[PDB]
Amino acid sequence: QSPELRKDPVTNRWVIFSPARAKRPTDFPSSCPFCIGREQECAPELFRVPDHDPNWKLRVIENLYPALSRNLETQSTRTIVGFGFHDVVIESPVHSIQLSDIDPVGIGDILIAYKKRINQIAQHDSINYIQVFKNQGASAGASMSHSGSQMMALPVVPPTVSSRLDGTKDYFEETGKCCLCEAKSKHFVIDESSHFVSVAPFAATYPFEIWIIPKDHSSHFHHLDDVKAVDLGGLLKLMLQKIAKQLNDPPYNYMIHTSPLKVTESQLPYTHWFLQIVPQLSGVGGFEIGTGCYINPVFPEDVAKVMREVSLT
Amino acid sequence: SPELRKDPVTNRWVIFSPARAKRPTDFSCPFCIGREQECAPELFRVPDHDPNWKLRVIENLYPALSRNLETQSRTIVGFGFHDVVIESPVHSIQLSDIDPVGIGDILIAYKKRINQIAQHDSINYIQVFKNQGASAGASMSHSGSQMMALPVVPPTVSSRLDGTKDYFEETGKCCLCEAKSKHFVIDESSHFVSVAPFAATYPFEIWIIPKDHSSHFHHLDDVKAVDLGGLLKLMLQKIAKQLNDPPYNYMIHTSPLKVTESQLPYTHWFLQIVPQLSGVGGFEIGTGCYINPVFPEDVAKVMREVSL
Lengths: 313, 308
Ligand SMILES: Nc1ncnc2c1ncn2[C@@H]1O[C@H](COP(=O)(O)OP(=O)(O)O[C@H]2O[C@H](CO)[C@@H](O)[C@H](O)[C@H]2O)[C@@H](O)[C@H]1O
Ligand SMILES: Nc1ncnc2c1ncn2[C@@H]1O[C@H](COP(=O)(O)OP(=O)(O)O[C@H]2O[C@H](CO)[C@@H](O)[C@H](O)[C@H]2O)[C@@H](O)[C@H]1O
Ligand SMILES: [Cl-]
Ligand SMILES: [Cl-]
Ligand SMILES: [Zn+2]
Ligand SMILES: [Zn+2]
Ligand SMILES: [Zn+2]
Ligand SMILES: [Zn+2]
What we know:
homodimer, alpha+beta, HIT family, subunit A, ten-stranded antiparallel beta sheet, three-stranded mixed beta sheet, binds adenosine-5'-diphosphate-glucose, binds chloride ion, binds zinc ion, ADP-glucose phosphorylase (chain A)
């Protein structure tokens, strides 16, 4: 098909769609420290679920090799000290269980644990943005094969958030509308649950990228409630299981995109959180490193069609 | 001990964190001489119209953007030029093995192609880049680089214009004119200086920066082409020795084709070299903020001491 450039407020950048790219030739542990019974081999615990239960289903712990130091906080008040929080979420007691294998309720409990930790961190005025994310598979950057995700509290609003705030503001000012409240008309619907919808994003950065989006206008992920957590957990699991089947269990990353902690009232109407899932299908080269512009070999129209047709029976 | 650093050129914070490097882990061809019929249409060669060619610039067979959608121009048509620069008649030679003169010819080719392209009002920015090695993204094992001409100025060019502008407004200075006092000098030639950038995105990243204030790469002349050739050869060879011949990417950062007069005083082209040492995860995809396990102070001391 013919190449196209697409833009979206959320990314606030163009992406190249070009399927002819896919047609080019080319010349080229049963336990771990995260496993139950081995807690003393981990950096300190923040909490577990159930609370203080020796028979835990998840734990939220400090990252033992953290990118940022929680002990540089008061100094945090072209260079700034490397203060922040880096935590790990152990999603299973069993090494061989993956996130998508967990049932909706349990996935919901992991989501509520994200929520609890965000709320702890947000008591610090030094923190401006909290990034939750998950790596599964070596080529998606994973170093622990055990099923886990991570949280990184930042003293600064990072560039995707600045970009999204600018793009979503411009769209609100031109149309009066939150672009994500209009996800069903602006993007390609795959599946829908009671409170969330998953779409293939119109101006998708990566092939088979998927966004899961609250249908209600909701600025902060941390505003998630128990009922919405189980509903999101089922939709997240479905999207992961449909990805696993259709694309032959590739590695993936997922990333919650949420509100800055100090979001202003005037930002609220066009600030709407979402969950981004990127199956790891290939790397980038010099074009992308040079420009910050990506090349996508699959149109989201085709992703949605295919992903709608996926049968998990 | 971890730290955040910013630079007007990236216009973004990067996180330096050396502890991160301690964590454990559980884990012939169609471009060769005479096979030109197996290639997309030639744009030119060097020497010009010589059957005994040294380099060729040709159309990309599987283009990201179509050179045939020009009149047609949340959506725009996928118009642009996607060109391949074949760097050798021979398959086993890699760019860094070429002599400074021959590397300069490649750099002069880039400039000639740039200037062909700048005759198109439809075009706003041209990205010259190279991939060497499968993990840096290569599909053709033959030595080659690429040119992507875009109808719009892309995110890093916008960030750079913004960040270099703010710095110029704050200081009256062009920040890359201050390279020797802002970054960590590794090597220097008659007209270029190579550095480990202060707020480098990637471990072992190196910039090659004209010492004269020069907004466009394509203003390169024959003398500077050879001078740059040798400094680029030198950095590529130092990387291969120090770092056990890793894959790499390099990227020319240059000015938009329609750069305004008032943007000139703070607009300064440079060549970025990124040895391919690590991948990203969800933090970088989520935020667009990177994590760099090696301070540029440390890269520069190591690279100064490499002997070939
Ligand atoms: N005993 C222990 N107790 C507590 N924590 C322990 C531990 N042993 C190991 N850890 C931590 O566990 C984490 C596991 O994380 P992942 O496997 O998701 O990817 P990682 O963060 O290594 O790297 C990927 O994700 C990061 C974040 O995006 C990228 O920067 C990087 O390039 C990519 O490879 C590591 O951060 C590690 O420090
Ligand atoms: N017979 C022929 N005639 C003309 N051209 C031919 C040809 N046969 C192959 N080609 C082209 O030659 C190029 C070889 O380029 P590279 O090895 O630098 O990486 P490639 O562009 O494949 O992908 C890497 O670079 C891009 C851009 O940075 C990333 O998007 C991508 O993920 C990464 O793998 C390809 O672009 C291909 O289209
Ligand atoms: Cl939140
Ligand atoms: Cl140029
Ligand atoms: Zn384990
Ligand atoms: Zn909304
Ligand atoms: Zn060859
Ligand atoms: Zn300058």
